[PDB]
């Protein structure tokens, strides 16, 4: 799960949209696969085909989230001509939130997902720029 983030981050910002979109789609698909595995383990489906349908639904939803976020972030960083800016990732996060609202067939979830996912993606880009660490090595 470390090589997927590495292959997403080694692509420079706003250079090749296809590779970034594919990497973000793979990361989203892995997250959706984990979520679907935990859902079918903790809550047993009434049939095998129901379980496969739920797994496919979760995987496709999260893959669409990742693909839309990566595509929108790379296109906005290309057209706005600045690669090191968290506003591009904020726009991509709101696009992902709108994709979540389109997947869940509601508007309020879409608006809240736009706001919070845009904030989270901007925070992720800010941490990548400033070198913030969440799993910090013990140095003191």
Q: Which of 44, 47, 108, 135 binds another protein (CB under 8 A)?
A: 135
Smallest gap, in angstroms, from Cβ of residue 132 to another protein?
7
Residue 27 or residue 75: which is nearer to another protein going by CB?
27
Distance CA 102, CA 73 (A): 18
Residue 105 or residue 139: which is nearer to another protein going by CB?
139
3-state secondary structure of 85: coil
Residue 108 or residue 131: which is nearer to another protein going by CB?
131
Q: What angle do CA 103, 37, 89 make, to 5 degrees?
A: 45
Residue 1 or residue 79: which is nearer to another protein going by CB?
1
Q: Does 79 bind another protein (CB under 8 A)?
A: no
Here's the x/- map for another protein, 114-133, by CB under 8 A: it reads as -------------x----xx
| CA 140, chain centre distance (Å) | 34
What tokens does 102 get?
Answer: 């389109």
DSSP alpha helix (H) spans, the chain: 2-9, 17-42, 48-79, 86-104, 108-130
How far lies 138's CA from each of 15, 34, 129, in Å?
36, 29, 21
Q: Does 138 bind another protein (CB under 8 A)?
A: yes
Q: Does 48 bind another protein (CB under 8 A)?
A: no
Residue 10 or residue 137: which is nearer to another protein going by CB?
137
Distance CA 103, CA 86 (A): 25
Residues found near another protein in the complex (CB under 8 A): 127, 132-140
């Amino acid at each position: 799960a470390k090589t997927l983030l590495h292959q997403y981050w080694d692509i420079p910002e706003g250079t090749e949209c296809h590779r970034k979109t594919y990497a973000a789609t793979s990361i989203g698909g892995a997250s959706g696969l984990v979520v679907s595995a935990y859902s079918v383990a903790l809550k047993t489906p009434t049939s095998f085909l129901e379980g496969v349908a739920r797994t496919g639904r979760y995987t496709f939803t999260a893959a669409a989230i990742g693909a839309i976020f990566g595509l929108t972030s790379c296109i906005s960083a290309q057209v706005r001509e600045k690669p090191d800016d968290p506003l591009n990732y904020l726009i991509g996060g709101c696009a992902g939130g709108l994709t979540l609202g389109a997947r869940t067939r509601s508007y309020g979830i879409g608006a809240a997902a736009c706001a919070y996912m845009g904030l989270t993606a901007a925070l992720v880009k800010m941490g990548q720029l400033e070198g913030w660490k969440v799993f910090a090595e013990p140095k003191v």
